[PDB]
Amino acid sequence: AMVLLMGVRRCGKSSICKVVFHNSTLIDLAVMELPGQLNYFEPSYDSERLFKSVGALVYVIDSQDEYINAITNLAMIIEYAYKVNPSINIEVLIHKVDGLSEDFKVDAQRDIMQRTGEELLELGLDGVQVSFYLTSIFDHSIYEAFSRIVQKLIPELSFLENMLDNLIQHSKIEKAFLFDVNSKIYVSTDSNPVDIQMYEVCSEFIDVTIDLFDLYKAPELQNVSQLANGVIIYLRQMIRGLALVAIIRPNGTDMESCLTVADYNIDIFKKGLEDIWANA
């Protein structure tokens, strides 16, 4: 599942790649940037194997600059991308939206959606669905957008959802995330809505864990962080680069008993995750 990053020059693809992936199917592989300038596309210039090897195509649109020509070039790209392979998920990111109001952001997203839909109607493409995400480097939005893009390329999503739901239901967990060690891209969660504040807490917990481990090296990552109100934050490294982060509430119980039952349940969950080849 190799995703391809496409966009105009100075839209922010390299900065996005650096911020996300520098700080296979599921691991954060070396993605491919592609500077696409305005030109006439050559018909079948040995690009069929390239687009057939892309799990999902990601397009970047700069909201600061004019984007009508960007949407036109995007439509030209989709015009052969959907023709070569009709199973490619197409994603569009509206980057650099940090200095915009909520109403302006929603209006811009609606205008971009309407323009893309009308241009695809003009080109005669049918049965194609394009997702849109409002992304920015300075906040959590790019992480959530890449999380959705990665989640669209894991065929075992619902089974992981059921497994995490059962784990949370039998361990008094508030919210459990199945992160990855790099890029902080959470892979699976429960049916509960992804709270932004809790996601940022878990991401900074991942950063603190990795940094503190890297400070003392050269002699399986586990971490328990308990707050003042009894709320604990748990960490346990899963198979390959996956890591499990959960927020467990005590509900007026013993701390050590809760830690023991959570450790046993999470070890059982890891043993179950060993059978499924969701890693790497």
Partner: protein, 151 residues
């Protein structure tokens, strides 16, 4: 304060089996030896005769044993039970309870006048009376930990 190395060595020494010479009666070693608290049942120190999964299983068993012991410590009805062996050493009274855990013989004894517990677990072939004598003589040598409370 406390010292983990000396308590670990003490538990490793209490994992020693019995080999009688006048009567040929070989006994196996204990399955696990550990010290747990009297409030939450968590493992303070532990030692095994023979990795993380076994530690978690031992913690779960310690929690189960403390949960069963908590109701027995607060019950005064049916006090003349055949599985209770209350011994008084150095004018300190305690109660010892023996339990059966499927195929494992688990015996626990509270360290007298303190918030600590001493637990010995062996296999199903191990006799209960030898466990009682073992844990009594172990509590005889633990006079320095008497009167210790959690901070």
């Amino acid at each position: 304060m406390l010292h983990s190395k000396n308590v670990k060595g003490f538990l490793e020494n209490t994992l020693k089996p019995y080999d009688l010479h006048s009567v040929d009666f070989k006994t196996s070693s204990l399955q696990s030896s550990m010290i747990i608290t009297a409030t939450n049942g968590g493992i303070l120190s532990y030692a095994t005769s023979n990795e993380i999964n076994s530690v978690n299983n031992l913690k779960m068993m310690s929690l189960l044993i403390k949960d069963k012991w908590s109701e027995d410590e607060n019950d005064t009805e049916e006090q003349h039970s055949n599985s209770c062996y209350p011994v008084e050493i150095d004018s300190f009274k305690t109660k010892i309870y023996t339990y059966e855990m499927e195929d494992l013989h688990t015996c626990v004894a509270q360290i007298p006048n303190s918030d600590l517990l001493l637990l010995f677990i062996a296999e199903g072939s191990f006799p209960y009376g030898l466990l009682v004598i073992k844990i009594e003589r172990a509590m005889r040598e633990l006079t320095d930990l008497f009167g210790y409370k959690l901070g």
